[PDB]
Amino acid sequence: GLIVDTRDVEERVHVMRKTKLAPTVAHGVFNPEFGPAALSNKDPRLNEGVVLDEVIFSKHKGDTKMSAEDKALFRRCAADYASRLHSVLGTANAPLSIYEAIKGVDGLDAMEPDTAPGLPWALQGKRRGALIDFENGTVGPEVEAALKLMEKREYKFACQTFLKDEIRPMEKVRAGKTRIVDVLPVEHILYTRMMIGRFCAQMHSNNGPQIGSAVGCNPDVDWQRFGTHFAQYRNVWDVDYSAFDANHCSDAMNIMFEEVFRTEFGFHPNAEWILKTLVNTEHAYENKRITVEGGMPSGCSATSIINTILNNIYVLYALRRHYEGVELDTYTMISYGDDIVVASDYDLDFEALKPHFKSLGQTITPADKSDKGFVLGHSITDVTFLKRHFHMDYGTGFYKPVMASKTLEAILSFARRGTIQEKLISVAGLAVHSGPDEYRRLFEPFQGLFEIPSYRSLYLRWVNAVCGDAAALEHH
RNA sequence: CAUGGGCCC
RNA sequence: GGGCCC
Ligand SMILES: NC(=O)c1ncn([C@@H]2O[C@H](COP(=O)(O)OP(=O)(O)OP(=O)(O)O)[C@@H](O)[C@H]2O)n1
Ligand SMILES: [Mg+2]
C-alpha cells in the first residue's frame, strides 16, 4: 500500500519489546541459523546502519492502480470464484449473534480472552476482560456503544502496529525483517465476525481444493486428502508471492469485497462496509501516525480468509489475462493466504504470468529459486505448503507433512520462560513424520530432563486420525 | 503472558 | 493457557 506520508503525534505507542524467547539445552547442540526477531533498533546483533523502524515500512512500495478493462476482467473472476464459493457454501450468511461472534459456531473458534485490545483501550489501560465477558460472551459500554456506531457507518478507527516476537532465519534478523502485526480495535474484530462469521465457519469446514482454501484444515489428516488429489495432475507448481498481504491493491480489494460479500448471497449490507474500512488505514507505530492506502492489515480479522479468497481470484485473473477459454476447471489450487499450491494438465506458463500478476502489484517467483523460472513436471512431492513437504509413509501408504530438520531444530532451540515441556509435546507430533531415527536425534537434548512422547504412541495416534479404520486394519 | 484466522495437547 | 503454520 501507498503511504500518503507519516505524521508526528503527541501520544506515543510503546511496543519495542525484548524477546520473551530464550535459548534451550537443544540450542547449543544444533547451532541453528535462526534467532528471535529484532524487537529493538538498538538490539546489537542487528547489522549496524539499520534503523529497525525503516524496514517495517519498506513493504509499502506503492499501490498499483488498475486499468478500467482490468477492473472488469477482475470483477468477472471475483464474481466467478464467488459463484463457485457460494455454490459449495450456500447462502446462509445472516449476521452472527454477539453471543457467537464471542462464543463461536461449529467451525469458528471463540474470540481469545487475554489478547491485546487495540485502540484506544491500551491508551487508557484496559484489557479485553473489561469490555467483554469472554467466557460469558458479553459486551460492555463502549463496545456496545460502537456496535451501535458501525451499524451507522459513522465509525472510524486506527491500527496498533506491533512486532512479532518470533524466530526468523539469522539473516532476516540482521536485515531487520521483523514481521509486523497490525492489531485492530477489538470491537471491530467483533462486528466483522458478526458480519461475516457464518461465512468464515463454512469456509473453515469445507476447506479443500474445490473452494481453493485450506484455512480450517489439519495439516496432519488433511495432507492425505490433498496429496492424492494433487497427484492426479501432470503439473504442480509451488508459487511464492512476497509482500502478498501489503500489495493487495486498493482496486483488487474493493472489487472482491463487492463481489464476494453482496447481499444477493445472503450477507447484511454492512459486510462490505466493515471490510472496506480495511483498505485505507491509519497505522499508529508509536508517535508516527503512518496513514496508508492499499494493502491488508496483517492480523485484521479474517485476515487469512480474505487473503485466500484473493489469491484464488488472482491466479484465475492471471490465467484469464493471458489465455482465452480458461475456466475454474482449467486448473486446481489450494492456498492459505500467502501460501499456494497450483496444479494443471494444460502445460501452463507461469513465467508468462509474472507480468499479468505485476498488474495487481504482486510479485510471484518460483519456490526453487536456484533454478531461474517456473518449469513443468514438478509433482506434489517437490513442493511445500505450510512449511511441510508431501511424503508418503512407509508403514501405511498414506501422505504426511514433513518439516525440514533445520526448521524443527529452530523451533526446539527457543521457548518462552518455562514453556519447554508443553512446547515439546506440541512439537512432538510434528516431528513424528520425520521417522524414528530423526525424531530421536531431534530429541536427544532433552532426555532425562523432560518428558518425551514415545515415537510409537505418536505414530498410532496419527494412523488413527488419518483414517481410523486402518488402525483397525493393522489388526485382522 | 502479539493481532487475525485456522488447526494440535 | 501453550505450540505451530498462515
Ligand atoms: N499474523 C497475521 O496477521 C498474519 N499472518 C499471516 N498472514 C497472511 O499470510 C501472509 C504471510 O506473509 P509473510 O510473512 O509470508 O511475508 P509476505 O508479505 O507474504 O512475503 P515475503 O516474505 O516474500 O516478503 C501475510 O502476507 C498475511 O497476508 N497474516
Ligand atoms: Mg510455497
Q: What is the CATH number of the domain that holds A473?
A: 1.20.960.20
Total of domains in chain A: 3
Comparing every residue's Cα with the C1' atom of nucleotide B3, the nearest one is: A183
Domain that holds residue A393: 208-248+303-403
| Number of the ligand closest to the Cα of A178 | 1
End-to-end CA distance of chain A: 60
- Domain co-membership, A453 together with A349: no
Chain B bases near protein CB atoms (7 A cut-off):
1-9
Based on the fold, state whether residues A155 and A286 are members of the same structural domain.
yes
A427-430: long-range contacts, CB 8 A cutoff, minimum separation 24: A428/A452, A428/A453, A428/A458, A429/A220, A429/A453, A429/A458, A429/A461, A429/A462, A430/A401, A430/A403
Ligand 1 center–CA A476 separation, angstroms: 47
Task: Give the integer Cα–Cα distance in Å for A37 and A360.
Answer: 30
Distance from residue A145's CA to the centre of ligand 1 (Å): 33
Read off the CATH number of the domain in which A374 is found.
Answer: 3.30.70.270
- Residue having the nearest C-alpha atom to atom 7 of ligand 1: A298
- What span, in angstroms and rounded, lies between the C-alpha atoms of A39 and A16? 5
Q: Are A317 and A77 in contact (CB under 8 A)?
A: yes
C-alpha cell at A213: 482454501
Shared domain for A17 and A116, answered yes or no, is yes
- Pairing assessment for the beta strands A288-293 and A280-285 based on DSSP bridges: antiparallel
The label of the residue with cell 449490507 reads A269
Nearest to A186 by CA among A135, A130, A128, A129: A128
| End position of a domain, from candidates A353, A378, A403 | A403
Identify the residue whose cell numbers are 494438465.
A345
Asked whether strand C has any atom less than 7 Å from the CB of A426, the reply is yes
Same-domain status, A41 and A86: yes
How far away, in angstroms, is A30 Cα from ligand 1 center?
27
Q: How many C-beta neighbours within 10 Å does residue A115 have?
A: 14
Atom in ligand 1 nearest the alpha carbon of residue A247: 18
Q: Nearest nt (C1') to A407 (CA)?
A: C4
A300 within 8 A of A184, measured Cβ to Cβ: yes
Count of C-beta atoms within a 10 Å radius of residue A146: 20
CA of A107 to C1' of B9 (A): 19
- A304 strand C contact, CB < 7 Å: yes
Torsions phi, psi of A243, nearest 5?
60, 15
| Closest residue to C5 measured CA to C1′ | A386
Alpha carbon distance A380, A204 (integer Å): 23
Q: Among A403, A438, A454, which residue terminates a domain?
A: A403
Residue A337 Cα: closest atom of ligand 1: 9
- CA gap A59, A338 in Å, rounded: 15
Q: Who contacts A271 (Cβ-Cβ below 8 Å, separation ≥6)?
A: A93, A195, A196, A261
Which of A302, A331, A347 delimits the end of a domain? A302
Reported resolution, Å? 2.8
- Would you call A162 exposed, middle or buried from its count of C-beta atoms within 10 A (0-12, 13-18, 19+)? buried
Contacts 24+ apart (CB under 8 A), A15-19: A15/A161, A15/A162, A15/A163, A15/A285, A15/A286, A16/A40, A16/A41, A16/A163, A17/A163, A17/A165, A19/A165
Cα A363 to ligand 1 centre (Å):
13
Same domain, A238 and A280: no
User: Residues near A472 by Cβ (< 8 Å), separated by ≥ 6?
Assistant: none
Same domain, A215 and A263: no
A352 and A431 share a domain? no
A82 CA to centre of own chain: 20
| Size of chain A in residues | 476
Question: For A189, phi and psi rounded to 5 degrees?
Answer: -45, -25
Distance CA A257, CA A251 (A): 10
Indicate which residue's Cα is closest to atom 10 of ligand 1: A338
Query: Of all protein residues, which has its CA closest to the C1' atom of B1?
Result: A114
Give yes or no for CB of A336 within 7 Å of strand C.
yes
Q: Is A85:A26 a contact under the CB 8 Å cutoff? A: no
Nearest ligand to the CA of A367 is 2
- Indicate if CB(A406) is under 7 A from strand C: no
CB within 8 Å of A142: residues ≥ 6 apart: A131, A187
Taking the C-alpha atoms of residue A400 and residue A393, their distance in angstroms, rounded to an integer, is: 7
- Cα–Cα distance between A131 and A119 in angstroms, integer? 13
- Judge if the beta carbon of A367 is closer than 7 A to nucleic acid strand C: no
**Cβ atoms of residues A329 and A36 within 8 Å:** no
| A50 contacts A41 by C-beta, under 8 angstroms | yes
Sign of CA dihedral A15, A171, A337, A68: positive
Instruction: Count the neighbouring beta carbons within 10 Å of the beta carbon of residue A282.
Output: 16
A263 CA → ligand 1 middle, Å? 30
The rounded Å distance from CA A383 to ligand 2 centre is 7
Residues A167 and A143 in one domain: yes
Contacts of A244 (CB under 8 A, 6+ apart): A307, A311, A337, A338, A362
* Residue A203, all three cell numbers: 469456509
Cis omega (within 30 of 0) on the bond before A120?
A: yes
A461: cell is 495416534
The dihedrals phi and psi of A21, each to the nearest 5 degrees, come to -85, 145
Strand partners, A283: A159, A290
Q: For residues A184 and A157, what is the distance between their CA atoms, to the nearest angstrom?
A: 8
Protein A333 CA to nucleic acid B6 C1', in Å? 18
Same domain as A437, residue A297: no
Strands A365-366 and A339-344: unpaired
**Which residues, listed in sequence order, are joined to residue A31 by a DSSP beta bridge?**
none
| Contact positions of strand C to protein Cβ (< 7 A) | 1-6
Can you give the distance from the CA of residue A412 to the C1' of nucleotide C3 in angstroms?
10
The ligand 1 atom at the shortest distance from the C-alpha of residue A300 is 3
- Residue A243 makes CB contacts below 8 A (sequence gap 6+) with A59, A61, A363
**Positive or negative torsion for Cα A430, A435, A441, A445:** positive
- Experimentally, the structure was elucidated by X-ray
Q: Which listed ligand is nearest to A368 at the C-alpha?
A: 2
Q: Using an 8 Å Cβ cutoff, are A8 and A429 in contact? A: no
Q: A365 with A412, same domain?
A: no
**3-state SS track over chain A:** CEECCCECCCCCCCCCCCCCEEECHHHHHHCCCEEECCCCCCCCCCCCCCCHHHHCCCCCCCCCCCCHHHHHHHHHHHHHHHHHHHHHHCCCCCCCCHHHHHHCCCCCCCCCCCCCCCCCCCCCCCCHHHCECHHHCCECHHHHHHHHHHCCCCCCCCEEEEECCCEEEHHHHHCCCCCEEEECCHHHHHHHHHHHHHHHHHHHHHCEHHHCECCCCCCCCHHHHHHHHHCCCCEEEEEECCCHHHHCCHHHHHHHHHHHCCCCCCCCCHHHHHHHCCCEEEEEECCEEEEEECCCCCCCCCHHHHHHHHHHHHHHHHHHCCCCCCCHHHCEEEEECCEEEEEECCCCCCCCCHHHHHCCCCCCEECCCCCCCCCCCCCCCCCEECCEEEEECCCCCCEEEECCHHHHHHHCCEEECCCHHHHHHHHHHHHHHHCHHHHHHCCHHHCCCCCCCCHHHHHHHHHHHHCHHHHCCCCC
> Are both A423 and A332 inside the same structural domain?
no
Taken in order A182, A188, A194, A195, is the CA torsion positive or negative? negative
Same domain, A93 and A128: yes
Q: How many Å apart are CA A230 and CA A103, to the nearest integer?
A: 36
Asked if A262 CB < 7 A from strand C, the reply is no
Ligand sitting nearest the alpha carbon of A304:
1
> Ligand 1 site: residues with CB under 6 angstroms?
A 179, 181, 241-246, 296, 298-299, 303-304, 307, 337-338
CA of A393 to the centre of ligand 1 (A): 30
Of A290, A354, A385, which Cα lies nearest the Cα of A59?
A: A290
Alpha carbons A195 and A307: distance in angstroms, whole number = 17
The alpha carbon torsion through A156, A53, A249, A259 (nearest 10 deg) reads: -40
